[PDB]
Amino acid sequence: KTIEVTAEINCFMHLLVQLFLWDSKELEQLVEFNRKVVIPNLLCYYNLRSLNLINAKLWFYIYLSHETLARSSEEINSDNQNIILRSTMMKFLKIASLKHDNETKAMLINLILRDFLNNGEVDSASDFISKLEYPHTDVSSSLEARYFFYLSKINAIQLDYSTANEYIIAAIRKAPHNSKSLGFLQQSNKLHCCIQLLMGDIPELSFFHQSNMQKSLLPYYHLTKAVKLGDLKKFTSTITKYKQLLLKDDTYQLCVRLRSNVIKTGIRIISLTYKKISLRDICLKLNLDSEQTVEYMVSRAIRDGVIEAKINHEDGFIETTELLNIYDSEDPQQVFDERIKFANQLHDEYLVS
Amino acid sequence: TTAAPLLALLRENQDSVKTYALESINNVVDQLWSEISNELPDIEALYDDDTFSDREMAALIASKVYYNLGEYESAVKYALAAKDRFDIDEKSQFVETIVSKSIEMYVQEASKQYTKDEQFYTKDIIDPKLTS
Amino acid sequence: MPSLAELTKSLSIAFENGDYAACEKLLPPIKIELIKNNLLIPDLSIQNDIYLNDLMITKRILEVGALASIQTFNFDSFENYFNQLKPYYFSNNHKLSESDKKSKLISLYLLNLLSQNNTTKFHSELQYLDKHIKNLEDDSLLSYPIKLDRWLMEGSYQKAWDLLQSGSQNISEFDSFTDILKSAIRDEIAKNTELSYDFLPLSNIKALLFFNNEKETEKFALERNWPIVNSKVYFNNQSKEKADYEDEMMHEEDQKTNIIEKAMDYAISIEN
């Protein structure tokens, strides 16, 4: 009886799975039936311990089709269908206990987090993450990267360049094999490149060249160069060209965010290192960028911390500091603390194994 | 997926306005909870009134939210105060979970209290609500 | 809307001819009527019912309540109406109960959101719109708040100020926001200036802050607590100790102590 019942329940999980990707009858049509098996007569049978006897695949495939919108393109324009799915999955997250059902808890977090990111509030994120934090021994490497990726994107919107950096770098470690080195790796990589640009500037483009799809890489190169060389005119014209890119990735928000940085990068290249640097050279450059805010921009820069300076507009001079032999005491204090932390964690990893 | 029409009404006044939202919110707390958590201070504010006596219904919604966060001691208290809307024979994911925690809390209290006294459950030293 | 015999009709007619306070008095009784109707909250039991005394009526009433709230200068109440109203247009998708005053409320809503100085909320709202591309660009109304938001970040205070003063929308109900927005920019511009200049003329600072009366500039220089000598403002970029806390900053002494504790962490990791 035990053996017979388990065997059926496994059999059903295979059958639905095989019946999607390569053997479906139309994914949208099938959703009803998937919802029907889950809600009555399945959760009811489980004793709240399932991790492997339910799987990400069922919710992933159903939800994937609702967001495709070219094999669906709705069935109600009121938006009843998709809202209900978001509620039903949100309800499940209560059902996955805070002491049990741990792998299954995390899969729910990834799906819910996506839907808010595409089109919603991404401060709705904040609760899901707190709830997620409990002892785990069962959440897989693929799921972890997915976690990290949604998390970085949110923090990127909120304007923490640093948090999203550590997480994004962590993401592309562990999971990537040959089935996660595919489309997922491409999404992750887009964000990882962007993040570096916003916080500061991105490493060389040499490494990325052989580790990703080339088709993606050419548009990414174009975007990075414009920011690094600092010209505004480059950045707009480039932004115009790869509209299609920024839309697919869900990164139209970059256009607002990167713009301030470009204008900043164009002052920064110029090494204002002498005791006084004349005003005229800096006004001269700015005119192309800015038609009414030449003085404002030089001021804006000084307040930001891009250059330490003095201006008088009577005498029309910029006096500045040496932008070369900076990096002194306590810059090692930051490095020394941070690098030791990195060392302790690796030693810990040796002890465990 | 928005609780915002309903949540917006809590911030307005008139008892009628508060009633119309409450009962809509009650059915779908478990489902809509992410959005509802941010309006939590306001929902506590309904509860702390005793001129507006649909305090117990605020309390019941608030408990659900408190569970999901992981403040179990707090949820248990509000669940008690809800009274005629806390029914243990309904047996959902909501009801089962706060019931568990409730027995837990009496047991803890009952250790400490046995060492002091030998009659405490008949008295008002501990919560009659818990006892009931 | 024409007069028939409802509160709803009378309120729409009043708002148009003024009577903003009268309209705000009417809004709680108008609410009461709505409570009776179950059609106040938006449903997902619809097949596609967009008739008057369905979604459509309910939409029109909320809008007028939002507009009244603005006029009375009651930004919180605007949000209340907006939270209620917002699903009716679309959450992600719905096309059949669309209007052009929609464009103007959402833009008023972005701007209201801006003066409060939250980048994350701003962005979050843009995402919520039916599409990223279509909505942000297409609408004239939406364009004003994105453009102001870009330049505020950029440092191009003067373009943004100038754009609000000359504006079409300035006549309407961007008027409300103009006074808040002006103070916020001028504050930022005074700090940029405080850093950048050792000295600057008083005439120059009166023009940058977007004054042209001598006296106001003396009051603002004083508020900011700058000494002024004659013909010139002098600037002191004036720090103090603290601005909240967060240790690694000294509740009781020593970064060297923070090194000793973090040394116990790596010296326990050796011995054993």
Curated annotation (Swiss-Prot), chain A:
PTM text: N-acetylated by NAT1.
The chain residues annotated with the modification Phosphoserine are S329
Keywords, A to Z? Acetylation, Phosphoprotein, Proteasome
Q: GO biological process annotations for this chain's record?
A: proteasome-mediated ubiquitin-dependent protein catabolic process; regulation of protein catabolic process; ubiquitin-dependent protein catabolic process
Q: Which residues form a coiled coil?
A: none
Q: Which GO terms describe its cellular component?
A: proteasome complex; proteasome regulatory particle, lid subcomplex
Q: Name one GO molecular function term.
A: enzyme regulator activity
Q: Report the domain of life of the source organism.
A: Eukaryota
Pinpoint the PCI domain residues: 145-325
- What miscellaneous comment appears in this entry? Present with 16700 molecules/cell in log phase SD medium.
Family per record: Belongs to the proteasome subunit S3 family.
Q: How does it assemble?
A: The 26S proteasome is composed of a core protease, known as the 20S proteasome, capped at one or both ends by the 19S regulatory complex (RC). The RC is composed of at least 18 different subunits in two subcomplexes, the base and the lid, which form the portions proximal and distal to the 20S proteolytic core, respectively.
Q: What does this protein do?
A: Acts as a regulatory subunit of the 26S proteasome which is involved in the ATP-dependent degradation of ubiquitinated proteins.
The protein's name: 26S proteasome regulatory subunit RPN3
Q: Which species does this protein come from?
A: Saccharomyces cerevisiae (strain ATCC 204508 / S288c)
UniProtKB/Swiss-Prot annotation, chain B:
Q: How is it modified after translation?
A: N-acetylated by NAT1.
Q: What are the cysteine partners in each disulfide bond?
A: none
What does this protein do, in the record's words? Acts as a regulatory subunit of the 26S proteasome which is involved in the ATP-dependent degradation of ubiquitinated proteins.
Similarity annotation:
Belongs to the proteasome subunit S1 family.
The miscellaneous comment for this protein is: Present with 4750 molecules/cell in log phase SD medium.
User: What is known about its subunit structure?
Assistant: Interacts with UBR1.
Q: What is this protein called?
A: 26S proteasome regulatory subunit RPN2
Name the gene behind this protein: RPN2
From Swiss-Prot, chain C:
Q: PCI domain: which residues? A: 76-251
S-S bonds = none
Q: What does the record list as GO biological process? A: proteasome-mediated ubiquitin-dependent protein catabolic process; ubiquitin-dependent protein catabolic process
One GO CC term, this protein: proteasome storage granule
Alphabetical UniProt keywords: Proteasome
Please name the PROSITE patterns in this protein's record.
PCI
Q: Does the keyword Zinc apply?
A: no
The further comment given in this record reads:
Present with 9890 molecules/cell in log phase SD medium.
> Which family is this sequence assigned to?
Belongs to the proteasome subunit S14 family.
Function statement = Acts as a regulatory subunit of the 26S proteasome which is involved in the ATP-dependent degradation of ubiquitinated proteins. Necessary for activation of the CDC28 kinase.
Q: Please give the name of this protein.
A: 26S proteasome regulatory subunit RPN12
Species this protein is from: Saccharomyces cerevisiae (strain ATCC 204508 / S288c)
